[model samples]
Target chain A: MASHITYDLPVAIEDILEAKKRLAGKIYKTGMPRSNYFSERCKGEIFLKFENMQRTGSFKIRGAFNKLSSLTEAEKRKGVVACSAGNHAQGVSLSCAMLGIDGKVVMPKGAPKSKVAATCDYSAEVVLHGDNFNDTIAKVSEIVETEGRIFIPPYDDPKVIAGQGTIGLEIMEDLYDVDNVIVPIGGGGLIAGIAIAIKSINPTIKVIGVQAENVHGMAASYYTGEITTHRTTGTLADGCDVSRPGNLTYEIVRELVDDIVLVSEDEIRNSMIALIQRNKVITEGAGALACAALLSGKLDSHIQNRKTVSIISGGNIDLSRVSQITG
Target chain B: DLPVAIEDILEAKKRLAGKIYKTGMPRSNYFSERCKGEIFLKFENMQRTGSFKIRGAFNKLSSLTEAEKRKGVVACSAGNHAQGVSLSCAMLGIDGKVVMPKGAPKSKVAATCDYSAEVVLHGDNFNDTIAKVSEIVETEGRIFIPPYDDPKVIAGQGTIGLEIMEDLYDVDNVIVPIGGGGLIAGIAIAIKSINPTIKVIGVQAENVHGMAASYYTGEITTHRTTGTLADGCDVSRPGNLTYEIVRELVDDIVLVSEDEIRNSMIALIQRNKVITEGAGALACAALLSGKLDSHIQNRKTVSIISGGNIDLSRVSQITG
Candidate 1:
């Protein structure tokens, strides 16, 4: 069993406020459009927080930029390093490039060429080392040990979680009486952060987490009542297929999140296609999971005339994948 | 040959101002390099109903007498024209009927239905549908709205050319796609009349080069059924009304391959992130294929992307 600590972190509402203050103009406000589309479809008033339209084409920029911005001058001079196969890599590279801080991105050998090229385009030195994500993580850890660079873990740090929580702050400010917020879970950091931020403001508002059935690390954590270790499996929702949950994120999720649900790859693909064909919005497999779950009636039992917000977290889908899905 | 006067086009512009979108003219640096000229795209694809068909549809519908409006309007088309009629009718609260080929894409039919217009799947082939629509218009007394034939429709489409000339007064050449020839015929008359120095080139799909072939032969050209990715511009022949306009106004007609159209579609989607249907990407194809390079050398040119209402499945097939 994973040990839990009860250390007093900043209140969720306070963290949300700080997030909004710091991330106002830097990030696009993507939550307003969600309410418009959702209200039309679910009979109940539904809203979507569209973090997919955020800069760098994902919500990761919010955390990555906030974290790097808060670093001490000494730490900034030392530079930063991160391990990611997708959006987070672009996020870190862009933030560091903009801040004039040298940064290194470590990716697995088989990551998409487009992603690798995009990261390099943001003026970061990219190190391709390892066959899989775990190997890439180990390589990044080794770099941190030798280079004395600050390691920006994808979702583990408090600053990173607080940055992600900023999305929730926008949702609350835009709409009143939000009954539930559904977020796609990967490392559990997004849900953990958003749940704390939302529930603290209105404890009556439930926070639900969605995981790809192929690799449900967050769901496993919820089931076992602790962070569980399991081998990562391939999933269409590749952004969310975590083998292990972050220790700090797991603690927050355990306390704040109301429920965790799992969706399959087919559901994810259909949802991605539906969003593109119907709404004229492109979405990656992971970003479409919340909509998939809701459309497939996975969340219908809990959603009856209640106001719900589904967060579409990113939009950097491969053009090849888009062709395949639509074709 | 008849000369289309500048004053007529100017009047059309006044009639259409504020009613139609003053679509943004975007510069394509990549297309400019390939075409050997500065290329400005008139993005009519971003128009209200996702096509330039709205210009004619609105003008025709709005110009209708109260008795004519009550009698309703009827048109036959595979896609964009159908959508234009449906939308115009819904907005004006006038009854509209669209006769489409039975094989029309589901998404196209759904979009038409969404505009609250009654859609009748009449015939297996486009010509059959046209014949049926004509019969109904004659028998039922509904105003038969032709896609690209009527003088009023040509006048309405001329408004785009007026907008283009106003935006870029020194443009040396204007390239437009020809399906039934209404778009290019109207645009050419407007541009050439105002600035006789400006060159006007019309592009047509090689597989269905009906209007271009007819214009070249100085007679109506007929072709066997030829499949093209540009379903919107797959006309078998130029209409009587459009043929006269093309003979009088348009300077030259060029033909582009389906391969070039596909590549342009992919390039627009990947680089520009704008979803353009096959017909809409034809002007870009003509530029990219080096067909218009000579005329465009050392001069400013405008190419109209006339529509964007494409089937998602068809887009996937072309891009994939």
Candidate 2:
């Protein structure tokens, strides 16, 4: 039973500004287009931040580039190894290719072929290991020790959080009067960074976080006022199937994020469909999480003629996943 | 056939440079692998007003005499054309009236109105809407802006072809969807003028393929039908000016089934992570369905996604 908790902010707003400078021309400054479809439904001026259209089909590239660019000459020479079965794999892989660094990604053995193929296309070696994220991380840890390869953390690192925070800066620049920002959470890096950027710029702005119901560990931790884990089975939001949030991410999220909400699997699917149909764009289940929360009436109390933004985190969905909906 | 020239297109390009969105032409690895060709998608769907019609509408409106501009413009369409004309009129500071069909999409009607046009939901269908538009032009003495068949309109749409050549000079084939034939005719003129060896292919929905039938029969033909998923490409006849340009410049015309169009839309949404309405997917559908297999194999092909203005309510039926 925990109530009060606090920590010194590890990733500062200045660090994010520096990351934005470093990431210029390396990644797309994707659009934050207003959506008539969602605005009408939610009764707010709803804008969709399309990080889904970012390089490597996700916002992961921002963090990946910023993190890899921060590495010392010694660390760069040691090579890097990342562990993920989805967007992070492609992000780190592409970042390595761009920087001319040797890198390897350890994904779950049964990771989707489309994602695996995309990662390899970026010239990263794939080391298929384990059945789940924990097992894959274990394999990565073992490789990092044996091979002396630098471990590129997906979300927990200060550089990565700052890199992800650049999106917050972009949102403020585009819609300075933005009333609320809803972002999706897996390991909490995305929301944690965005919350810091948004809150620092405009403390009155609400920074909300969304997660898939099956993998609502971050939301659970937020509600319990302590870092907590939630178990889950198969879910449509495969990209966000994390059972836990990273420690650094959890700390930042707890301090800055206003609220954390959970959306059902069906809600995620319907949002994906809505994005394709109405907005003329595609988003994976994880990308649609923030949208799912808003469209599913999970944020009904927060939005009413308010200027809101839902960050579509990624668009790297497998064809089979979409086929399931259509077929 | 030579009414619209490269100079005309070049002039239109100059006029359109600052006005319209210089939409991206992204190379697709997914489509390249599937079609056995180097595939590039010219996303006119991402254009202002969500269609390529704005290029023509803007150009046509700009070319009007000063007196004609003051007279105001009347145009007919249920969807994309209405939006294009409405937006162009607002930008050029000319009063405009868009005579849309009673059955037009509510979003389109609302958008046309939002763009500072008086929306007249006249006629039960497109022909009746056009008829009403002609009546308005006669009675009100308003300048009638035809959706296609005008030399300036063809010149405006030809800028897209000019852009394609500038981006990919060695492109072997260019696929465009045909309705009144303005888009494809304009593109054919632009491409053929640059390099006659480069083939220009037109695709039309099989259910409503007036242009394709006309191309094959060597005569202007009227082929009208209803309930096509590609509502934008459901024109009953090709424009006389456009048909002449197409006859001389366009290499071939292909017809795609309704099912093929649906599948292509799905593929774009799934593989390319881009959304296109049914008419927008016709060229892609034609390529995916092997209609252009013999010609496009190992060739550098560009498929123009003309527009993305599908009704959201139809998603269930489209996906189903």
Candidate 3:
């Protein structure tokens, strides 16, 4: 039953149906087309969930909208606040814009200008604060207190996590006979939500997680069953460069998730170009992470010839680098 | 509406049921809000092999009798048409050969070959390329697949207009990029046949306006110097079938600068997050460049982004 809200296992899948009903009209039901070109290369059926084609250009908007709908009229009136490198900012901002609720987003001072401009374009009050992301988050928390605004945590909330699982339901409904599902992991919310939902429905289906090799904070800890964070942060897949996994997400991922796959920066760039040239769709480094895992031959051998899907998490690429992956 | 029957387009749609993607026409927020007119984009760039050519190619190839299919197919194209023909041949398991001008982008040629086509480098211009490929059609006894100017091919391409009509309820205007005159000819026939009041405008790059030149003058003017970034539409010749149809159905012909094409190419990527080759960005280039401002003033317009097979090397140049 999806009647009760709990931050535990056997919880995500049902609540996601709850989230789907809640997110209707608020989020775009982006297509999950079978990518024939990539499918041939991987020697299996491949379906690409174009969360990149979503209204805010990412699936994070799903969570943002789901979370917003959770708010009381008092909280909605007080407005919502969020902190992100890029996608989540646009997600919460666009959701707020659509709901006619005020939004304030704080991003790094050196974030891509295109994403920064897009944040403002959604009628969100943009605050450019901190070269250090950790310290900048402190400033966002301060505003949450001082302004009496609701803090919309990117991946830490149960409502937000359930919102992302809405994708898992769509994958199952759309792709027939799915044996393996690949997803990109950042703060663990996305994979956590999907892991719980998908496993509950199809117990035999493998849910693999992809994380950037340079910043494998969540990937490294997946083996030890412990919470961990990484220091070195220079990655084109910056959307997955989370310092730490969420407390709730860590619990769900440790229990429900099957395996974690790591893809290098070069592999991600190659997959980004492959996606652009082949799919006629743009995928930022983080969005390209799961596709990179397949191109790099990271899926398990038993998974061969079975149905597979790579969730393209986002599409907000740095405009300048659209060429660097020129090959 | 126009003398061309709607049955031609509907029949094309039925033939293209499983082959071509029924691409959507999404409204552009930045351009519409910026330009003060509703701008809808029919993204043919998302088509198979990354162009609208496949719709025509598939229709033409599928129409071939089994005996003709056994004889094989040959086509001469710069890139887009070649790829379309190559894929259609591979699909129906027909032997295929494509001849391209020597300077055709390596990416398009390589993509054509990847789909199992014997690609031969021919002459410098479309006329020269056609002349060279004609000998092969004779010598090899392969049926020559014309890039445009066939009833079957025009009907195939008309499916795009049928889709746009199905997608938009009140599409006041449709803007298409003019190439060998086939693309706009098919769309003009398809749209104007259904809604005679709807304006179908063709955009040509000033650097490459052979079709536009032909539109003004009744004779086919093969503009010799091919100098433009929109290489796909930079053909020297315009087909007689297309010229006739454009005269019958088209409302206006507009021209955009090389600079405008480059600007919208970047903007489509930047704003829409959809990558487009130079030719694919032509319709948006028309809207953004103010070239058709008065003609499309406050009208609900749909711009067809025709392709996205731009070589990686050209992306930086266009984006920068």
Q: Best by DockQ, which number? A: 3
Q: Is candidate 1 or candidate 2 better by lDDT?
A: 2
Winner on DockQ between 1 and 2 is 2
- Pull out the clashing pairs in model 3: none
Query: Model 2: runs farther than 4 Å from truth?
Result: A1-7, B1-178, B181-272, B277-305, B309-320
TM-score: model 3 vs. ground truth: 0.80
Error of 3 at A225 (Å): 5.3
Candidates 2 and 3, the one with greater lDDT: 2
Q: Compare the candidates by lDDT and give the number of the best one.
A: 2
Task: State each model's CA lDDT, in order.
Answer: 0.78, 0.84, 0.81
lDDT of 3 at B159: 88
Which lDDT value does model 3 have at B25?
62
lDDT of 1 by residue, B1-320 (tens): 54344565566666666456466465554466566667787767666667888887777787788999999889887688988889888878889889988778887788888876789998888779989888988898888888888777777788888888877788888888888988887887788777878888888888987898899899988753587777778888888878887887777888889899999887666544446788888888888887777888778988888887776666777887
The residue ranges of model 1 lying beyond 4 angstroms of the native Cα positions read: A1-11, A34-41, A200-203, A230-232, A302-306, B1-73, B80-97, B101-134, B141-308, B311-320
* Model 3 C-alpha lDDT per residue in residues A141-250, reported as the tens digit of each score: 89988998899998988889999998888778765478888899989889888876787777678888988878887877777779887747668788898867888888
What is candidate 1's lDDT per residue for A216-242, written digit by digit as tens? 877887789878965457888878878
State the lDDT of candidate 2 residue by residue for B1-320, as single tens digits: 37778888888888887566455576665577799878888878767777899999999999888999999999888789899999899989999998877777788899899988899988787779878987998899998887889988998999998888877888999999998988987898889888999999999987898888888889999897765888888888899988888888888888889999999987776656677888899999998999899888988999999998865445445866
Q: What is the TM-score of each candidate against the true structure?
A: 0.64, 0.64, 0.80
Clashes per candidate, residues 3 or more apart or on different chains: 4, 0, 0
Q: Rank the candidates by lDDT, best first.
A: 2, 3, 1
